[model samples]
Target: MIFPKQYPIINFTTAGATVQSYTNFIRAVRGRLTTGADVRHEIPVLPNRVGLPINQRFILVELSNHAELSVTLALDVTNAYVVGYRAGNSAYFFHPDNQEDAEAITHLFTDVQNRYTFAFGGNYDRLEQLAGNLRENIELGNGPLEEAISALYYYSTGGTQLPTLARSFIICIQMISEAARFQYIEGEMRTRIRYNRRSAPDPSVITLENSWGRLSTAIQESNQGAFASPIQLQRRNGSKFSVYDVSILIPIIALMVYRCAPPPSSQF
Candidate 1:
């Protein structure tokens, strides 16, 4: 068979969620591409049934002039995963500097693959819809919303390693801060919250900022904390601040995002 164009491809194998509709699956994956680039995607036929299994499918992803992301996906009644992501091009996948694009696709895709349910509570459906909304309406891609989602993905899949977990926690908090600021500047929070140059910053704003302060200290001083354990940090005034894990932390972040979300409007 003659291929359309030559491209680099990387290989991957993972399993988790089940695929019911390729239509929804394709849209869901495409939606994860925050760059908003035109992605030509399709399910192509497969060869060599030697080691193939049941409910297996193939996807061919093309982004003109970029590498091809092709993978064999296997599904069961309750879950699905990528068997192998051996693609058409290898250069793009192996290039050191090309990680941004490759990672943009795989990181979120891994989240979908595992169907990771958040400790606080989240799903791919809402995330896909929200991602589309943030992308099409306000052209907000690679922003706080996406960053938060990515952080969650990392948190879920980064195993039980403390450093990874800590970083993910930090990232989630940062995203909330960024999202709140974004809403205050261009989203619905502008009207809901007011600053008359008299009131101390909004209560939630102060709370978010305080979290940032603790998080910054944690990072700057290389504070090492255990999973599901709280760590204490010293403030400038010799006060003590505590940092927690994803369980309670993400819920607070979620509430912050919910509060910051703009009401349905044309610009948003």
Candidate 2:
């Protein structure tokens, strides 16, 4: 498939977020040489999936190895550039060097936005395993997943106090996080089954401009905290990912494409 080039894609490619986005924003604002400066190439992002403000057009991202990450965000409103954060004002960012630091940025943003947050550890590719699992009605939802999905859909597409953020957009992210959880469970089950004789269950879907607490309440706690997370799996090798160490935002972004948004496979 021929993909549209999303320049300065938000990610930890050869360069980190700060250097990557800033350099583009700098050029976009500064203008350029022979071919001309290509500034709009800038895009902010997190690795794999979920991220920032609902109303804001968040960029994509990938993790890096620097403990401290520095990046810049430029919104050329006047076709003219503006000033901004970390240097002065910007939200906390994920640690390039430490994957666990994300939970820090996640909670900070969550509290500030009055929105919900979850840390799901699972294999994103497994979302495709959901062969025929269409998103059923909320009432029909089964366990921790089903209820979460219904709640999110309700929150996303509903009328709520969170008018600043788009309900549908937020709901979309919510489903991504949940789907990751389901996929995580599926992986765990498959692993267990391979060793023994059991299989995993499934994952699920969300909505709305509701209070962060309301959203939090709707997302009933799952006993299955961070399943077979490779980050945690490294425990035997020497590393720990606290249940509070990850962010659902990044992973959810991935789900939107791979899970909830994609067309079913031809084989399916």
Candidate 3:
């Protein structure tokens, strides 16, 4: 499949209050990750306190048919660890002198684990719900084909994440996208797009070429712009600089395109 090379420009704006809230949210989430406590402990005690600001937002466009796909991006700080402390060691304990602080840290760690578990579990549930909703919506809508395809895009983009969680989410999104495409192909061509279905094929067999090609090109184009930003994390004196921005984008876009492709035939 030939995917287009069109790139969408994203502009981010925030109010001072929004930025403050976002920073607090990050701190809370990070604290939860390191200490295993609930978010309440990290909540700022002030009137008119704004909640965390969303870290990222992606606008997905369907090139075959122009449609708006909505997705909100929030970071999951699940694996953060305290650098100065060793487990079961009193010398560098999180609460070196205070028993209450130590207890808080314990609570924070437990909360973080529970929060991550719940977030992942909720995402799975949402996927199932999205599938059912898409099917029903397509069946009842005027252009079921386009609507289905758009739904698949929304589902996949909304659920993008890290590698360990990417495979399952990718599979879910792929199944949805293919189901929509399959329905469209059946309606248009009046024939099934068939392949051997008994054994699953390697995901790379389908995605490595097309999706990676588009993403690689996009990354090359984006490097200059990203590096140009004065406050960019990729810049010196701004933050710890690296090419993680480009590195992470490939997998994300590949996963999105994988969802947009037809199902595999044989097991790898």
Candidate 4:
């Protein structure tokens, strides 16, 4: 009934002739955000048979959560292409700068389309369940779970951007670790070391502590400030490869999260 009190501020606008269907689509997305987003859109009219200079219409979306965070998307609608530029305190902990915004729109468009497809097919029950899930998980505020979800979105959508993949992947790890209440590896190691001396050593504790250390190392190395430094490793055969490969890193990080904070079979 009331506006979402903590919704992120968002503005969407187009630079060329406004298409009604596209405008409605944008509005539908804004509405589904349901997380209290204050959305505004601008549509401009132009002649139908416009040339290249006139065909250069751009769709822009500016998102912010007060002064702490801001991310801007500029879409070349003609090419169905978009790019995002972000700034703020936690910018690095989000969708990486190098990735294209194509999937963002792709997923957004397909999701809205599916909603309508279901509606037209008389699938109200599924829609009702989806609405509940959106309410539970779609908040746009600065929360660990929210950020984790957002980070995972980018990680899954990232094409070949190692920076984007690694950054997003590490953000997921950090957020999930926070949710799981993981202690700093050093502290955990010290306690475990002392405990092991007085009692039988626990293999699981040692393995978990090592995993924590690896997670921490990845976070520190992939963060904005320390990123871009080379971290190549040599194989037994002398071939070298960078450590930021998402293909290799994502699976392990995902497993760690599952082991640490498993989802509910039915809910969570």
Candidate 5:
């Protein structure tokens, strides 16, 4: 159940789409905080099941007693390529944060590389596939953000039980001019996606470079719309009354001991 540590991490924040859709409904409406409870309730259940658990939880907190806003943010695992043992053989899972045991766990990368090569012909097709799947699923309203969060959680846990303290945050602004247009909304959302490694031999295995590359690409593609302009509306006087901002953060709280090289005695 060991995970890799070299997984390239990406962190970014933006404004929410739905927030713009409902800004005008509650403008200058003091003490009015729209709660999207449906999405908030699902944030914690993402780990242990998705390809990339959300290592962090995303939150948009707004307290417009007069004109102030705030936000918070938050990003898995699989089997079928075990190393240092026979098929179906299980080893004691180690936490990457444990310096004493990090080296042994880091060695799992070799096995990961080996299996990844054999399954994907030494290419990153597998990574691309996973990332594409994630993007497609999420854009289709299947909850891509939630799935990625779950996957990250699973990976961080090294296949262990998901932790409770892990969280992420994001902050956004609301435009006063467009505030009365639609109903202002705030809250969180969650979901899960599954991931697995390709098959390979025990030692001297190749790594799946494409998986990371593809994932990076997929994330970019999945968020293409969010990055576009016209994210919010303006006022007749060309003033920005309502604004939207979004942020996502994933904490590298733990490592997948099996996917990295031996940590230096002083570094770990």
Candidate 6:
């Protein structure tokens, strides 16, 4: 397969290395290796050991259209993932910012509800329930296609992720989204006013401000904005000069950095 030059392939040299970017040296090596004829390059003699136990795996997700796609491999977490939905011949793809890119999948699934207007979350209960139903099918998949489905299903549990399961979750989301749209359009859904801070001091709070012959004229205005000068709080809220809180995070960061760093020189 012709690997895109822009989507640079990664090969870590250390256990602690972060998957941010590959060095230019590695980039050149990767370019040559992929383009070169049937050939192999030996690892460079490093002053120190290469890397810790590097574990990784990948799978090709073939949709109903039989289109196969390479699963996403995340070196940062040393995990792989693929997410898709087969409702239509459509799926949006993005590499989430962190090791747990799957979180975005949940966001998208929730967005599918309410036409993606309001971010009504807390829908994983439905998806997890769907996952239970597929557990048997996933374990008992026999035929080639069956095996593929099972393989994808099993990985999406926690450690690994598959696009197919992501697709399933998305379907769960779409089902409700469609249901809600139908309810509103069919007038089965009627809405009054729901207040956020309405308490029992004043029982129910429902109002219909029909006015201006259009109910379009603004009456009550909303005041929702960030404080002009609010307290600034952060996990690493130490002063730049010598923030103790900021310094606390350094050990965790440095440990990973040092793991990826080259072994110290031995010219002594």
Best by lDDT: 4
Q: For residues 67-164, could you state the per-residue lDDT of candidate 1 as single tens digits? A: 22222221110111121122122111111123332333332223232432122211222333433431112222123223233333333334334333
Clashing residue pairs, candidate 6? 82-162, 82-163, 83-163, 84-163, 84-167, 85-167
| Superposed Cα deviation of residue 43, candidate 4 (Å) | 18
User: 4 or 5: which has the higher TM-score?
Assistant: 4
Candidate 2 per-residue C-alpha lDDT over 51-102 given as tens digits, one digit per residue, 9 for 90 to 100:
4222221222222223333222212121111111111122323122234333
Which stretches in model 2 have alpha-carbon errors above 4 Å?
A: 1-104, 111-119, 126-268
lDDT of 3 by residue, 1-268 (tens): 3322222222111212132432343333323322232211111111111232111111111112235432212211221112111111111112213343233333222212122211233232344353343221222111332333333333333432333222323332333222222222112212111221212223332332223334333333343324222211222122333333344332222111111111222212
Task: State the lDDT of candidate 4 residue by residue for 1-268, as single tens digits.
Answer: 2211221333522222123422343343323222232111111111111242222333444433222333443333322122222322111212312333322322222212121111111121222243343211222112322333343234323432443333333322222221122322222223423333212113332233234334433433343323244345444344655555223433222112111111222211
**Which regions of candidate 5 fall more than 4 Å away from where they truly are?**
1-125, 130-142, 159-268
User: Model 6, 4-107: lDDT tens per residue?
Assistant: 11222432222222213213322332232222221101111111113321121212122221233222221121111223321222234333444443443433
List where candidate 4 sits over 4 angstroms from the true fold: 1-25, 28-50, 86-268
Candidate 6 global CA lDDT score: 0.24
Candidate 1 CA-lDDT value: 0.27
lDDT sort, best first: 4, 1, 3, 2, 6, 5
Native-to-model Cα distance after best TM-score fit, residue 18 in candidate 3, in Å: 42
Clash counts for the predictions, in order: 11, 28, 10, 0, 57, 6
Count clashing residue pairs in model 2: 28
The regions of model 6 sitting more than 4 angstroms off are 1-78, 85-88, 92-127, 134-138, 142-268
For all predictions, the C-alpha RMSD in Å is 19.9, 21.0, 22.2, 23.1, 20.8, 22.9
Angstrom error at residue 131, model 1: 27
| Model 4 accuracy (lDDT, Cα) | 0.29
Worst 10 residues of 2 by lDDT: 78-87
